[PDB]
Write a protein that binds this DNA or RNA. Structure first.
Ligand SMILES: [Mg+2]
Ligand SMILES: [Mg+2]
Ligand SMILES: [Mg+2]
Ligand SMILES: [Mg+2]
Ligand SMILES: [Mg+2]
Ligand SMILES: [Mg+2]
Ligand SMILES: [Mg+2]
Ligand SMILES: [Mg+2]
Ligand SMILES: [Mg+2]
Ligand SMILES: [Mg+2]
Ligand SMILES: [Mg+2]
Ligand SMILES: [Mg+2]
Ligand SMILES: [Mg+2]
Ligand SMILES: [Mg+2]
Ligand SMILES: [Mg+2]
Ligand SMILES: [Mg+2]
Ligand SMILES: [Mg+2]
Ligand SMILES: [Mg+2]
Ligand SMILES: [Mg+2]
Ligand SMILES: [Mg+2]
Ligand SMILES: [Mg+2]
Ligand SMILES: [Mg+2]
Ligand SMILES: [Mg+2]
Ligand SMILES: [Mg+2]
Ligand SMILES: [Mg+2]
Ligand SMILES: [Mg+2]
Ligand SMILES: [Mg+2]
Ligand SMILES: [Mg+2]
Ligand SMILES: [Mg+2]
Ligand SMILES: [Mg+2]
Lengths: 199, 81, 61, 84
RNA sequence: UCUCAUGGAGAGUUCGAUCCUGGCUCAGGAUGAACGCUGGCGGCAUGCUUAACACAUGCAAGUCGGACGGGAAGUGGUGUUUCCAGUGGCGGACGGGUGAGUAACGCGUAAGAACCUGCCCUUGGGAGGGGAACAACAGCUGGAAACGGCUGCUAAUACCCCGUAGGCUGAGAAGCAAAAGGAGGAAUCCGCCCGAGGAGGGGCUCGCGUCUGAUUAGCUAGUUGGUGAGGUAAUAGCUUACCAAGGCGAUGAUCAGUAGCUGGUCCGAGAGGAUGAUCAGCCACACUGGGACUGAGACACGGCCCAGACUCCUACGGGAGGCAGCAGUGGGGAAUUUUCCGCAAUGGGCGAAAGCCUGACGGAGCAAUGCCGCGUGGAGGCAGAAGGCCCACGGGUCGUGAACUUCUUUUCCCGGAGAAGAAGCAAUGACGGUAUCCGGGGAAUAAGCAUCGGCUAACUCUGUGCCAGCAGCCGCGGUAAGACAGAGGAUGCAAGCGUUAUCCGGAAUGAUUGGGCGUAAAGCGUCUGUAGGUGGCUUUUUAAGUCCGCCGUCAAAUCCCAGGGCUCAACCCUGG
């Protein structure tokens, strides 16, 4: 139920994924293989747009396809409502705040009981955090060090408007609902809906 | 005979009952005609609408052992007679 | 009825118990059934790695 | 509306009159109103009815096998013979 | 510039080529699933669709001694007391299981009149006086056994009569009808008899809806209708005698075949199609058939009688039994589970009470059967090397992948702590030292399956040479195979992946919505006309259809919206 594989192997072919890792590829390997690939089919273009969501969030098709049903039930902009469910995931929120260098790295912190929400432990990376929800670490120096090391050993990216940070607890807070234009990944959401038109 | 008892409906090892008036010979999950309460031991919450319950007790409805205890903690018997 | 022997090589002979499934072979008129390899008496295909579940063959180790 | 009218054909039997009832109802697949027919048996102890007459039916306790109605006069009619 | 609308995708194949028409095939989703390869945990559910085939063993309905007589045990063979074979009372018609039969008031929905109803509730009046029996028991006696036979004794909330009556019969006069006592410092509760009501439950009738076939067209004779005499809790040819000749049907009678129905489940843009597992309600059946007793209630799964088939015991004279109850065995079949714990909770029966019983139910165990959720490591990794494959022989790819360095421990191992569920002062927990929490150790315990000719995302090399073989369709292979097999690599899924089977969709391919009949399949050879369908204009009547406003109902669960609770989800709950 997890990738556990190389990531540059897909980034050469797929696109760009700041969520997975801020590192970049090295080599434009060969002009030969680019001549081998050449053009792309329309189904492939809709396919590759879907795969970007499978990596940027660390999600399965079964887990993803469930969210598609919730968006279809929700009225208006089913493509936008989809990202409202993915961006509100706990694994993304702990990442966009900057408490981990990678979303897989953040998923590990959630799994080993290092974070609590509103005074209670949460052992689910797929937890949907509502507006006005507090996110704090535990009291152990091990837990405090991992988040403290993430906020200290490298520069910090500018945060959104819908997220804050109190450096005295090293915590965060969700203000309101995201806008579709504040996604952390260049997306064409309409193509994704066109892919799941059959299902 | 009409009787005031409670049926089970919930998850395994998490009992969540509801009070209801039905015939005795009918099974536990029998056809209902008036639901007149809700109860669980874990959370210990109770709505227990009194105007419907008194309608049956006047007509000869006999509570069970625990439903008698639930109504005993309430003051319905003093207004019933 | 009559069935088809998929795969390469087989040990079946008269008075043997097989297990039949669906599927027809267009090239052979009249044949409308396939047997399962890796069953009561039909053994898996020898020296087969790719598409190994469709013939009832243990994984090498 | 409530009860069923009908024509009183085949009134030969004693203290009884066969009655033909007609109704219209839409077809469920195609939604067209079709004229269906169904017969009944009623009783007139006075024998005040004969073939060619218009009669109304009422529910009552059963008198015999298949005869479970009572013949009465019609309530709402539109004779209106030669009105201005 | 409002709002509504969250919803309809195609592709290949006839030809030398094109436009059409028309079939076949595929991409989707689902399953009571099965098989193949593989396999870490947890949560909620599910688990004989076939032989309604036959069944070893154990259990699944008992209870009251505060209804009665006797008997046994114990004690200080003395009082209290404990146990019960029998008489008597209630329950054994609920609950559980199974869909064989059933095409019709069986089911669903919506109404009715000619009825019953123990236990519960409410209410008006009563219980006076006598007698006779069968059990048990005692004696004798027949049997291999199961079970008896005879002779005598005995109690009762068991039996019988008399007396009384707000009831029954009848036009009336008149005639008839009951009861039981038990416990007790005596207030006095549990009960009994008659009568009138309430609720629930059940019986009966009716409107509407309720599969296929016309190469089944005539069917019925107690059959349709009445009277009289019957009969049922009650209406009814429910039964019978006589009389009348009606009754059903080509809008499908009758006959034949199929099938449990429904809430709902799956698919679908919708209209609608298919379907009736788990859950819930009704009906029906209980080895195959028939019949009745008992009771308020049955024509009774674990009750009785008879016949038939089968199985078991036998001392051969004669007896016993019905898992379509739980678990389990044999057999059939591709295929579906422990001969488990407990009445702690829920519910049911008996009892004044204490308490007894409850294979219902609540739990555990087996299975990846399904749905949901979390892992099988994160970060960094300069340069270079071994190794696999490919090459235009320079290199490229596998590949930041690995090695290596640090960090963490869901899970794993060790050691402690430890519930809620219990309602009822306290005690009362099958599950269970279960969930859950704390501490220590340490990347340590964990990824595979299919595909890579086009539909269809993903490619080369070697080997083979119309061979071996692939394939859902078109079709590939005959010496440079992107279609076979192997290798490397890639793509798509993921503790699952694929194959097969079944239903829907795609399929506008039965075209109400939504097709066509000049030549592609399709206008009777033609005309007259019955039933049937439709029908010019104008003014009125009625309000059946139709439209609007209110009332009742279509259970709950499920679906839809909102809210809440399990660390999230599935899922559970509240409200609408
Ligand atoms: Mg999963
Ligand atoms: Mg051609
Ligand atoms: Mg069966
Ligand atoms: Mg008593
Ligand atoms: Mg006894
Ligand atoms: Mg009784
Ligand atoms: Mg008398
Ligand atoms: Mg008859
Ligand atoms: Mg008559
Ligand atoms: Mg059947
Ligand atoms: Mg359609
Ligand atoms: Mg049998
Ligand atoms: Mg019985
Ligand atoms: Mg039995
Ligand atoms: Mg069984
Ligand atoms: Mg119990
Ligand atoms: Mg109980
Ligand atoms: Mg027992
Ligand atoms: Mg399997
Ligand atoms: Mg790594
Ligand atoms: Mg392609
Ligand atoms: Mg193949
Ligand atoms: Mg070659
Ligand atoms: Mg190949
Ligand atoms: Mg169609
Ligand atoms: Mg056509
Ligand atoms: Mg022609
Ligand atoms: Mg033609
Ligand atoms: Mg004509
Ligand atoms: Mg409902």
């Amino acid at each position: 139920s997890r990738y556990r594989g190389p990531r540059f192997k897909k980034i050469r072919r797929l696109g760009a994924l700041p969520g997975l890792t801020n590192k970049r590829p090295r080599a434009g390997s060969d002009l030969r293989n680019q001549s081998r690939s050449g053009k792309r089919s329309q189904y492939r273009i809709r396919l590759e747009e879907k795969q970007k969501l499978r990596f940027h969030y660390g999600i399965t098709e079964r887990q993803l396809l469930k969210y598609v049903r919730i968006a279809r039930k929700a009225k208006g902009s089913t493509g936008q409502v989809l990202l409202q469910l993915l961006e509100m995931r706990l694994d993304n929120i702990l990442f966009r705040l900057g408490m981990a260098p990678t979303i897989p790295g953040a998923r590990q912190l959630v799994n080993h009981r290092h974070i609590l929400v509103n005074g209670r432990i949460v052992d689910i990376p797929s937890y949907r955090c509502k507006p006005q929800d507090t996110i704090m670490a535990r009291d152990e120096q091990k837990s405090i060090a991992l988040i403290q090391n993430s906020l200290d050993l490298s520069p910090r990216e500018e945060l959104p408007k819908h997220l804050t940070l109190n450096p005295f607890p090293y915590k965060g807070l969700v203000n309101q609902i995201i806008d579709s234009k504040w996604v952390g990944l260049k997306i064409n959401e309409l193509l994704v809906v066109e892919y799941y038109s059959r299902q | 005979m009409v009787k005031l008892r409670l049926k089970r409906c919930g998850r395994k090892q998490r009992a969540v009952y509801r009070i209801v008036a039905i015939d005795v010979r009918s099974r536990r999950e029998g056809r209902d005609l008036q639901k007149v309460g809700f109860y669980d031991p874990i959370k210990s919450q109770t709505y227990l609408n009194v105007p419907a319950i008194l309608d049956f007790l006047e007509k000869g409805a006999q509570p069970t052992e625990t439903v008698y205890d639930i109504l005993k903690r309430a003051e319905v018997f003093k207004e019933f007679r | 009825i009559t069935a088809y022997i998929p795969g390469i090589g087989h040990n079946l002979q008269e008075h043997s118990v097989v297990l039949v499934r669906g599927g027809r072979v267009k090239d052979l008129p009249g044949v409308r059934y396939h047997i399962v390899r890796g069953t009561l008496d039909a053994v898996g295909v020898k020296d087969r790695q790719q598409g190994r579940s469709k013939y009832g063959v243990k994984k090498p180790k | 509306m409530r009860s069923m009218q009908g024509k009183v054909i085949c009134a030969t039997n004693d203290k009884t009159v066969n009655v033909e009832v007609v109704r219209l109802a839409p077809h469920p697949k195609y939604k067209r109103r079709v004229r269906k027919k169904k017969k009944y048996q009623a009783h007139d102890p006075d024998n005040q009815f004969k073939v060619g007459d218009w009669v109304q039916l009422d529910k009552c306790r059963p008198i015999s096998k298949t005869k479970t109605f009572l013949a009465v006069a019609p309530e709402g009619r539109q004779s209106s013979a030669t009105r201005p």
